Paper text:
Acetyl xylan esterases (AcXE) that target mono- or doubly acetylated Xylp are well characterized; however, the previously studied AcXE from Flavobacterium johnsoniae (FjoAcXE) was the first to remove the acetyl group from 2-O-MeGlcpA-3-O-acetyl-substituted Xylp units, yet structural characteristics of these enzymes remain unspecified. All homologs were confirmed to release acetate from 2-O-MeGlcpA-3-O-acetyl-substituted xylan, and the crystal structures point to key structural elements that might serve as defining features of this unclassified carbohydrate esterase family. Enzymes comprised two domains: N-terminal CBM domain and a C-terminal SGNH domain. In FjoAcXE and all studied homologs, the sequence motif around the catalytic serine is Gly-Asn-Ser-Ile (GNSI), which differs from other SGNH hydrolases.
Author numbering: 11 to 349, 366 to 387
The structure:
């Protein structure tokens, strides 16, 4: 069997305001819920400490099928091991995969990942915009069926990705983006970001049954410089080339590169740098056997449009995506729009993606 990454999130350094509420992670247990795409019977999970400056010390990890919110089906709970060990402690900047574990993972299903921490500092790697409630209880409760009075926090910590073993040809679509991809305005706990809607359509169609979708969106992200979280260029290798089975990359990013410009000259400079960055990413993906699909968008909100040079430059970017011939194909969301992000808009976007782009090889 070969590994395929079925779920991912893009890690970053957690800002102070996005650290969990009391009692905190230190010495406590955190239960987190994710939606997988392709299913299977043998799994492994990777945890990331990539952006922290302190060690990540974990006493135990389990996986289970959720029942309702913070509870799990007790008969499904399985412990992870790390080179046989219950626990791990990994250096600043490192990550770790669990050993393989037998686990019946249904496609398009929710998985509860429960982590019991040792000492945790204020320097933590995670994904704040989870769009999903996580649950904290005191002490070591990795295998507790029912969490009593858990503290709720709508953030993810430590997670990176889940891989499944496959026997049939199976491949992943990775999606690099900002908050439009990460799911701003999607429904909390609903797992209804546009990549989830697209993922469900792949799984419901026989010719794309073995195609997973990896959400590498980060809210506020920029491609070239600035923004929130590591830039797309800086996280490209770690997020896109570091998974299992990636065959396609969708790029939906760049608006924030222009949204922060304050004069027309800087807007022009950031537009040129963004177009150069697209080519660097296309070339890197091609070198690794990955096709790249460029996605257009119209900027959301009013703050982008209060200075007119921004939209005039953004129209040039959309035109380059459409007409430069550098992308292997184009997903023209902007044109479809013209025919604030929210759940209905993500349903529309997810239904628009052409499944025929995910069928060759
Ligand atoms: Cl969660
Ligand atoms: Cl994903
Ligand atoms: Cl954003």
């Amino acid at each position: 069997g070969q590994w395929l990454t079925t779920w991912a999130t893009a890690p970053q350094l957690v800002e102070p305001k996005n650290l969990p509420p009391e009692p905190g992670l230190s010495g406590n247990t955190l239960r987190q819920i994710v939606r997988v795409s392709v299913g299977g019977k043998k799994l492994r999970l990777r945890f990331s400490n990539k952006y922290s400056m302190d060690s990540l010390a974990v006493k135990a990890v389990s996986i289970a099928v959720p029942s309702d919110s913070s509870n799990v089906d007790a008969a499904t709970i399985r412990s992870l091991t790390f080179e046989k060990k219950n626990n791990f402690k990994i250096a600043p900047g490192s990550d770790i995969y669990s050993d393989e574990v037998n686990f019946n993972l249904k496609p398009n299903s929710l998985l509860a990942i429960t982590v019991s921490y040792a000492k945790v500092t204020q320097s933590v790697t995670g994904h704040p915009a989870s769009r999903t409630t996580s649950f904290i209880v005191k002490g070591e409760q990795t295998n507790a069926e029912v969490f009593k009075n858990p503290v709720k926090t709508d953030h993810w910590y430590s997670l990176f990705n889940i891989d499944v073993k496959t026997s049939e040809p199976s491949y992943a679509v990775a999606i690099m983006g900002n908050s439009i991809t990460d799911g701003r305005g999607s429904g909390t706990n609903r797992q209804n970001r546009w990549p989830d809607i697209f993922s469900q359509r792949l799984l419901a169609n026989p010719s794309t049954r073995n195609i997973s979708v990896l959400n590498l969106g980060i809210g506020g992200n920029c491609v070239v410089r600035g923004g929130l979280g590591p830039t797309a260029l800086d996280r490209f290798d770690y997020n896109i080339l570091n998974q299992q089975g990636v065959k396609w990359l969708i790029i939906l990013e760049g608006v924030n590169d222009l949204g922060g410009t304050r004069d027309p000259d800087d807007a022009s400079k950031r537009t040129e740098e963004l177009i150069a960055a697209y080519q660097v990413m296309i070339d890197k993906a091609h070198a690794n056997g990955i096709k790249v699909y460029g996605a257009t968008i119209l900027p959301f909100g009013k703050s982008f449009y209060e200075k007119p040079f921004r939209i005039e430059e953004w129209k040039k970017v959309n035109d380059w995506i459409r007409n430069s011939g550098k992308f292997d194909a184009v997903i023209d969301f902007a044109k479809h729009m013209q025919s604030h992000p929210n759940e209905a808009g993500y349903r529309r976007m997810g239904e628009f993606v052409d499944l025929n782009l995910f069928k060759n090889e």
